[PDB]
C-alpha cells in the first residue's frame, strides 16, 4: 500500500514461547519494501512499544504513516502523544502474519544451530538475515536493497 | 558555522546526576545539521574521550574540524595525537548548552516513563529521538534528514 | 580484485591471545575498498562463522563473491548451505594478513590506553578506527568513504 519506502508501515506484537516464557516480539514492516524490524521484549506496555518503535526507526528510518491493531499499548495516551509530537499518522485498519512466520522460522533455525547461545542472538541473526540476505521474488532484491 | 554536514562540530562534556553518581555525558553536535552524539561515561579522561569521539564518528561520519573547550582530556597528548594522525583540525574557541538541555529533558522524560529500566536505555532513546524524530524549525526536517 | 565495493571479499580467522585465552578473530575484508569487519569469538565453528559473516554483512553490505581458505567452518555443510541459499559465490583460492596486522596493532594500542576496560571495547575501537579514521594512500580516502 505504501508507494515508496517509509510511506506506510504495519505493526503488531506477536508472541514467542522460549523456555517457558512468552516473549513479545514487537514487529514493524514496511508495506512497500517488506523491510522488517523486530524487538524481543518481555512485555508490551507503552514503554516497550515506544522503545521497539525507536529501534525500528533507527534501523529503517522514520515512517510517514503507521497502521496497527487496537491493542492498548498502541491506543495509550503515551503512544498517541509520541506519534502526534513527531508527526507520524496513526490509523488502526497477510504482511505482518507472513513476516511473523518467516521471522519465527529463522529464529527456530538459529536456535537449533547454536543451542548453547542466548535468544537475543537468534532474534538478531533472524532479523539481519531476513532484511539483508533473503532474495525476494519477482524483484531479485533483498528488503534492504529495496528499502535503502 | 559549518557549511555542510561534518564540516565543523562542537564538543563538550556535561554532567548528569543519577542515583548519587555524576555521569559525564560526552556530547558532539554538528554545527550545520544540529545532529548529535552523546555517550554516557563514568569519567572524562582521554580514554573515554577518544571512545565517545569514535562513537560519535560511527554515528555521524568523520568531521573535518572540531571545536572544544580547554578541558584537559581535549588538551591531552592522546587526544591531540588522535586528531593529528587522522587529519581532524582541532581548535578551542548556545549550540552545545541548548543541545545538553534538550538531551536532558528527553532523558528525564524517558526515565519517568520507564522507571524500572537502566539509565543507558533512556540515554539511547533520548539520542535517537532527538536525531530522528524531532522536527526542526523553519526547515521542517529532522537532524538525521539534514545530516545524511 | 573486486571491481567495486561488495564484489569480492577475502575472509580468514586469525588468533589473538589475551589473558591466556586464544580468541578467534573472524576477519572479512573487501578487496576493492579495503573495508573491514572483525568479530571476536571464542571459537571458529560454523555457528560462530555464520554469525561473524552476518555481523560483517550488517556493517559492509552483502557481497557477491567471497574467497576463503579451506578451514572446516568455511567448508561445513552449514556455511555452504548459507552461501547457496542467499546467492553468495564461494571460492577457496597479502590483504587479510596485512589487515590482521593493522587490526592487532590498533587493538594492542587501545588495550594499553585503557588497560582497565574489556577486550571487546578495544576490538570495537580498532574496527571503527581502521574503517573510518585511517586515511589510505594514494587515494586520500578512508575505507568507509570508498566503500559507502
Ligand atoms: Mg496485537
Ligand atoms: Mg567542559
Ligand atoms: Mg584459516
Author numbering:
A (entry chain A), B (entry chain A), C (entry chain A): 54 to 146, 155 to 209
Would you copy out the relevant sentences from the publication that reported this structure?
IN first catalyses 3′-processing of the vDNA ends, exposing reactive 3′ OH nucleophile groups that it uses to attack a pair of phosphodiester bonds within target DNA (tDNA), resulting in strand transfer.
To aid the interpretation of the cryo-EM map, we generated a high-quality homology model of the STLV-1 IN/NTD using the SWISS-MODEL server, and determined a series of X-ray crystal structures spanning the catalytic core domain (CCD) and the C-terminal domain (CTD) of HTLV-2 and -1 IN.
